[PDB]
Coordinates of C-alpha atoms in Angstrom, one line a residue:
Chain A
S1 CA -17.0 8.6 6.2
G2 CA -15.8 11.6 8.2
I3 CA -12.5 9.9 9.1
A4 CA -11.7 8.8 5.5
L5 CA -12.3 12.2 3.8
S6 CA -10.1 14.0 6.3
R7 CA -7.0 11.8 5.5
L8 CA -7.7 12.0 1.8
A9 CA -8.0 15.8 1.8
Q10 CA -4.5 15.8 3.3
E11 CA -3.2 13.0 1.0
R12 CA -4.0 15.1 -2.1
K13 CA -2.5 18.2 -0.5
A14 CA 0.8 16.4 -0.1
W15 CA 0.7 14.9 -3.5
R16 CA 0.0 18.3 -5.0
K17 CA 3.2 19.6 -3.3
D18 CA 5.2 16.7 -4.5
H19 CA 4.8 13.4 -6.5
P20 CA 7.2 11.3 -8.6
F21 CA 7.3 13.3 -11.8
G22 CA 5.0 11.9 -14.4
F23 CA 2.4 10.2 -12.2
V24 CA -1.3 11.3 -12.1
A25 CA -3.7 11.1 -9.1
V26 CA -6.6 13.5 -8.8
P27 CA -10.1 13.3 -7.1
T28 CA -13.1 13.1 -9.5
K29 CA -15.8 15.7 -9.7
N30 CA -19.4 14.9 -8.5
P31 CA -22.1 16.3 -10.8
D32 CA -22.5 19.9 -9.5
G33 CA -19.2 20.7 -7.6
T34 CA -18.5 19.0 -5.3
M35 CA -15.9 17.3 -4.9
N36 CA -15.6 13.5 -4.7
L37 CA -12.6 12.4 -2.7
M38 CA -13.4 8.7 -2.5
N39 CA -12.8 8.1 -6.3
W40 CA -9.5 9.0 -8.0
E41 CA -8.4 9.2 -11.7
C42 CA -4.8 8.1 -11.6
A43 CA -2.0 7.2 -14.0
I44 CA 1.3 5.3 -14.0
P45 CA 4.3 5.6 -16.4
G46 CA 6.3 2.4 -16.6
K47 CA 9.9 3.0 -15.4
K48 CA 12.5 3.4 -18.2
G49 CA 15.0 0.7 -19.3
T50 CA 12.2 -1.8 -19.1
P51 CA 9.9 -3.2 -21.8
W52 CA 7.3 -1.2 -19.9
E53 CA 9.3 1.9 -21.0
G54 CA 7.3 4.4 -23.2
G55 CA 3.7 4.1 -21.9
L56 CA 1.2 5.5 -19.5
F57 CA -1.3 3.0 -18.0
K58 CA -4.5 4.4 -16.4
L59 CA -6.2 3.1 -13.2
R60 CA -9.1 4.1 -11.1
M61 CA -8.6 4.1 -7.4
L62 CA -11.7 3.6 -5.3
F63 CA -11.9 4.1 -1.4
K64 CA -14.3 2.5 1.1
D65 CA -15.5 4.5 4.1
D66 CA -13.3 2.2 6.3
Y67 CA -10.2 3.7 4.7
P68 CA -7.5 3.9 6.0
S69 CA -8.6 0.8 8.0
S70 CA -9.2 -0.9 4.6
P71 CA -7.2 -0.4 1.4
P72 CA -8.4 1.1 -1.8
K73 CA -9.6 -1.1 -4.7
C74 CA -7.3 -0.4 -7.6
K75 CA -8.8 -1.0 -11.1
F76 CA -6.9 -0.5 -14.4
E77 CA -9.1 1.3 -16.9
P78 CA -9.2 -0.5 -19.2
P79 CA -8.2 -4.1 -18.1
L80 CA -4.5 -4.6 -18.5
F81 CA -2.5 -7.6 -19.7
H82 CA -0.5 -8.6 -16.6
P83 CA -0.3 -11.9 -14.8
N84 CA -1.1 -10.2 -11.5
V85 CA -4.0 -8.1 -12.8
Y86 CA -7.6 -9.5 -12.9
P87 CA -9.5 -9.5 -16.3
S88 CA -11.8 -6.8 -14.7
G89 CA -8.8 -4.6 -14.2
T90 CA -8.3 -4.9 -10.4
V91 CA -4.7 -5.0 -9.2
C92 CA -4.1 -8.0 -7.0
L93 CA -1.3 -7.3 -4.5
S94 CA -0.3 -8.1 -0.9
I95 CA -0.1 -4.4 0.3
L96 CA -3.5 -4.0 -1.2
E97 CA -5.2 -6.9 0.6
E98 CA -7.1 -5.9 3.7
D99 CA -6.1 -8.8 6.1
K100 CA -2.6 -9.4 4.6
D101 CA -0.1 -6.6 4.0
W102 CA -2.3 -3.4 4.0
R103 CA -1.4 -1.0 6.8
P104 CA -3.3 2.2 7.7
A105 CA -0.1 4.3 7.3
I106 CA 0.4 3.4 3.6
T107 CA 0.2 6.5 1.4
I108 CA -1.3 6.8 -2.1
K109 CA 2.2 7.7 -3.3
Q110 CA 3.5 4.3 -2.0
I111 CA 0.6 2.5 -3.6
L112 CA 1.2 3.9 -7.0
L113 CA 4.9 3.2 -6.7
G114 CA 4.2 -0.3 -5.4
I115 CA 2.0 -0.9 -8.5
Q116 CA 4.6 0.6 -10.8
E117 CA 7.3 -1.8 -9.3
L118 CA 4.8 -4.7 -9.8
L119 CA 4.7 -3.9 -13.5
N120 CA 8.0 -5.4 -14.8
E121 CA 8.6 -7.7 -11.7
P122 CA 5.5 -10.0 -11.5
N123 CA 4.4 -12.3 -8.6
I124 CA 4.3 -15.8 -10.2
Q125 CA 2.9 -17.7 -7.2
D126 CA -0.1 -15.2 -7.3
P127 CA -2.0 -15.3 -10.6
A128 CA -5.0 -13.1 -11.4
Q129 CA -5.2 -13.4 -15.2
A130 CA -5.0 -16.9 -16.9
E131 CA -3.8 -15.8 -20.4
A132 CA -0.9 -13.6 -19.1
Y133 CA 0.2 -16.3 -16.7
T134 CA 0.0 -19.0 -19.4
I135 CA 2.5 -17.0 -21.4
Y136 CA 5.1 -15.9 -18.8
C137 CA 5.6 -19.6 -17.8
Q138 CA 7.0 -20.9 -21.1
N139 CA 7.8 -18.2 -23.7
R140 CA 9.0 -14.9 -22.2
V141 CA 9.6 -13.0 -25.5
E142 CA 5.9 -13.5 -26.4
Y143 CA 5.2 -11.7 -23.1
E144 CA 7.9 -9.2 -23.9
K145 CA 6.6 -7.8 -27.3
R146 CA 3.2 -8.0 -25.7
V147 CA 4.3 -5.5 -23.1
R148 CA 6.2 -3.5 -25.7
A149 CA 3.1 -3.3 -27.8
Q150 CA 0.8 -2.6 -24.9
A151 CA 3.0 0.4 -23.9
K152 CA 3.0 1.5 -27.6
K153 CA -0.8 1.6 -27.4
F154 CA -0.6 4.4 -24.8
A155 CA 0.7 7.9 -25.9
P156 CA 3.3 9.5 -23.6
Chain B
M1 CA 36.2 -12.4 30.4
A2 CA 39.5 -11.2 32.0
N3 CA 39.9 -12.3 35.6
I4 CA 40.7 -8.8 37.0
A5 CA 37.9 -6.9 35.3
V6 CA 35.4 -9.6 36.2
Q7 CA 36.0 -9.2 40.0
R8 CA 35.6 -5.4 39.5
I9 CA 32.2 -5.8 37.9
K10 CA 31.0 -8.1 40.7
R11 CA 32.3 -5.6 43.3
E12 CA 30.6 -2.7 41.5
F13 CA 27.4 -4.7 40.9
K14 CA 27.4 -5.3 44.7
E15 CA 28.2 -1.6 45.5
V16 CA 25.1 -0.6 43.5
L17 CA 22.8 -3.3 45.0
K18 CA 23.8 -1.9 48.5
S19 CA 23.7 1.7 47.7
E20 CA 21.4 4.3 49.2
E21 CA 20.5 5.4 45.7
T22 CA 19.1 1.9 45.0
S23 CA 17.2 1.7 48.3
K24 CA 15.6 5.0 47.2
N25 CA 15.0 3.6 43.8
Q26 CA 17.1 6.2 41.8
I27 CA 19.3 3.7 40.2
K28 CA 19.6 0.0 39.8
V29 CA 21.8 -2.5 38.0
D30 CA 21.5 -6.2 37.0
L31 CA 23.8 -8.7 35.4
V32 CA 22.8 -10.7 32.3
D33 CA 25.3 -13.6 31.7
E34 CA 28.0 -15.6 33.5
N35 CA 30.4 -13.5 31.4
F36 CA 30.1 -9.9 32.6
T37 CA 30.4 -8.5 29.1
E38 CA 26.9 -7.0 29.6
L39 CA 24.8 -5.4 32.3
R40 CA 21.3 -3.9 32.5
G41 CA 20.9 -0.4 34.2
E42 CA 18.0 1.7 35.3
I43 CA 17.8 5.3 36.3
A44 CA 15.0 7.5 37.7
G45 CA 14.5 10.8 35.9
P46 CA 15.7 13.5 38.4
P47 CA 13.3 15.7 40.3
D48 CA 12.3 19.2 39.0
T49 CA 13.2 18.1 35.4
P50 CA 11.1 17.2 32.4
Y51 CA 12.1 13.6 33.0
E52 CA 10.6 13.4 36.5
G53 CA 8.8 10.2 37.3
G54 CA 10.4 8.6 34.2
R55 CA 12.3 5.3 34.4
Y56 CA 15.1 4.7 31.9
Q57 CA 16.4 1.2 30.8
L58 CA 20.1 1.3 30.0
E59 CA 22.2 -1.1 28.0
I60 CA 25.7 -1.3 29.5
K61 CA 28.4 -3.1 27.5
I62 CA 31.9 -3.7 28.9
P63 CA 34.6 -3.9 26.1
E64 CA 37.8 -6.0 26.1
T65 CA 39.8 -2.8 27.1
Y66 CA 37.8 -1.9 30.3
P67 CA 38.8 -0.4 32.8
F68 CA 41.1 1.7 30.6
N69 CA 38.4 2.4 28.1
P70 CA 34.9 3.3 29.4
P71 CA 31.9 1.0 29.4
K72 CA 29.6 1.5 26.3
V73 CA 26.2 2.9 27.5
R74 CA 23.1 3.3 25.4
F75 CA 19.5 4.2 26.2
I76 CA 17.0 1.5 25.5
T77 CA 14.1 3.7 26.7
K78 CA 13.7 6.5 24.1
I79 CA 14.3 10.0 25.5
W80 CA 14.2 13.6 24.2
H81 CA 17.5 15.2 25.4
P82 CA 20.1 17.2 23.4
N83 CA 22.9 14.9 24.6
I84 CA 21.2 11.6 23.8
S85 CA 20.1 10.4 20.3
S86 CA 16.3 10.4 20.2
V87 CA 16.6 7.6 17.6
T88 CA 19.3 5.1 18.8
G89 CA 19.8 6.1 22.4
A90 CA 23.5 6.8 21.7
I91 CA 24.9 9.0 24.4
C92 CA 27.2 12.0 24.5
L93 CA 28.4 12.4 28.0
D94 CA 31.9 13.7 29.0
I95 CA 32.8 10.9 31.4
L96 CA 32.3 8.1 28.9
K97 CA 34.4 9.9 26.5
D98 CA 37.4 12.1 27.3
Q99 CA 36.8 12.8 31.0
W100 CA 36.7 9.0 31.7
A101 CA 38.8 7.6 34.5
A102 CA 39.4 3.9 35.4
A103 CA 38.5 4.5 39.1
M104 CA 34.9 5.3 38.0
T105 CA 32.5 2.7 39.2
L106 CA 29.1 1.7 37.6
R107 CA 27.5 3.7 40.5
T108 CA 29.4 6.8 39.5
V109 CA 28.5 6.2 35.9
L110 CA 24.7 5.9 36.6
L111 CA 24.6 8.9 38.9
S112 CA 26.4 11.1 36.2
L113 CA 23.8 10.0 33.7
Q114 CA 21.1 11.2 36.1
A115 CA 23.1 14.5 36.4
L116 CA 23.3 14.9 32.6
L117 CA 19.5 14.7 32.6
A118 CA 19.3 17.7 34.9
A119 CA 21.9 19.7 33.0
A120 CA 22.0 19.6 29.2
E121 CA 25.1 20.6 27.2
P122 CA 23.4 21.9 23.9
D123 CA 26.8 23.3 22.8
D124 CA 28.0 19.7 22.4
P125 CA 25.0 17.8 21.0
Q126 CA 24.1 14.2 20.2
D127 CA 20.8 15.2 18.4
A128 CA 20.9 18.2 16.1
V129 CA 17.2 18.7 15.9
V130 CA 16.8 18.4 19.7
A131 CA 19.7 20.7 20.7
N132 CA 18.3 23.4 18.3
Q133 CA 14.8 23.0 19.8
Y134 CA 16.5 23.4 23.2
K135 CA 18.4 26.6 22.5
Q136 CA 15.9 28.4 20.1
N137 CA 12.8 27.4 22.2
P138 CA 13.3 26.2 25.9
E139 CA 9.6 26.1 26.8
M140 CA 8.8 23.8 23.9
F141 CA 11.8 21.7 24.7
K142 CA 10.5 21.2 28.3
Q143 CA 7.1 20.2 27.1
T144 CA 8.4 17.9 24.3
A145 CA 10.8 16.1 26.7
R146 CA 8.0 15.7 29.3
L147 CA 5.7 14.0 26.7
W148 CA 8.4 11.5 25.8
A149 CA 9.0 10.9 29.6
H150 CA 5.3 10.1 29.8
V151 CA 4.9 7.9 26.7
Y152 CA 8.2 5.9 26.8
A153 CA 9.4 6.1 30.3
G154 CA 6.1 6.0 32.3
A155 CA 6.0 9.6 33.7
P156 CA 2.7 11.2 34.8
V157 CA 0.8 12.6 31.8
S158 CA 1.8 15.6 29.7
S159 CA 0.4 18.6 27.9
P160 CA -3.2 18.4 26.5
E161 CA -1.9 20.3 23.5
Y162 CA 0.6 17.8 22.4
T163 CA -1.5 14.7 22.9
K164 CA -4.6 16.3 21.1
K165 CA -2.3 16.6 18.0
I166 CA -1.0 13.1 18.4
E167 CA -4.4 11.4 18.7
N168 CA -5.6 13.7 15.9
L169 CA -2.9 12.3 13.6
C170 CA -3.2 8.7 14.8
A171 CA -7.0 9.0 14.2
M172 CA -6.0 9.9 10.6
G173 CA -4.4 6.4 10.5
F174 CA -0.7 7.1 11.0
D175 CA 1.7 5.1 13.4
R176 CA 2.0 6.7 16.9
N177 CA 5.8 6.6 17.1
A178 CA 6.1 8.0 13.6
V179 CA 3.5 10.7 14.6
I180 CA 5.3 11.5 17.8
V181 CA 8.6 11.8 16.1
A182 CA 7.2 14.0 13.3
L183 CA 5.6 16.5 15.7
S184 CA 8.5 16.6 18.0
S185 CA 10.9 17.2 15.0
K186 CA 8.7 19.7 13.1
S187 CA 8.2 21.6 16.3
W188 CA 4.5 20.8 16.9
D189 CA 3.2 22.5 13.7
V190 CA 0.6 20.1 12.3
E191 CA 0.9 21.2 8.7
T192 CA 4.6 20.4 8.3
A193 CA 4.7 17.2 10.4
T194 CA 1.8 16.0 8.3
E195 CA 3.7 16.5 5.0
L196 CA 6.6 14.6 6.6
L197 CA 4.5 11.6 7.6
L198 CA 3.6 11.3 3.9
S199 CA 7.1 11.9 2.4

């Protein structure tokens, strides 16, 4: 664990100095103190000019003791409608896969941005959620007002 | 290429192969192709300098307008020197520029590059960050250059200080080269280099 905490202490310090305006990422409290650096309450605003415009989608960001050797698990709380997001809320992505495109240098900043850029531009060949895929493959506008309405559910 | 210039290169290539400087392992040169548009050079870092024991791989290109324009020389082996780009290896040396003369062999070129390594011109810089580190803080510049000589060019090991900081940041999970660059640039202050590596 010693290794992981060190890097995360520094990750937050940098994020506190500067982040892309509008994003949230903050370590949770342990009961009595403490503070828990291996569990983060995080938030992503969908870039403007998109259907994902006007919404703020929350995700938890859990870290294993291997980190930065292993990536964080990223879970949307609650589960999100997205072809690339599992029905339990977990974001499925190459840079977030241990033995694929994760690299120990990759910052939390770049994760959250990478997820944000996964929002409007989805990865067809890689499905995580049946229902969202089923749509995107035949009737796009049904997916569109679905995204429009989902963003409308979340106050800015 | 052009008949005339081709026989020059072959003469110069032979001059270097037979030179005293090569038998004493200070410089060497090798051809690549049939075509003599491109050579491979190597120089020993000079004695009493931060680059001592280093060995530097040089990319030599010969343009269509050689001998009247100079050969295009770039450092393949990364180096911390105010008159060479720490990033691309682009060089800023008088004799490959506006002090160039057509009678200058490849031997003369290689020896001048060794000389530039023992005598910086920080008042005419290729690397802003490095030149400013040279003038404002000479001792730090000597240590920083010496570390690069060790990591990239094979020179006997450097300052405990600098390496502690590197293998501290690499233990944090960052890329060595990125780490080395950061510290070198942010003048060995951990706090600032660290915020750069995130960026």
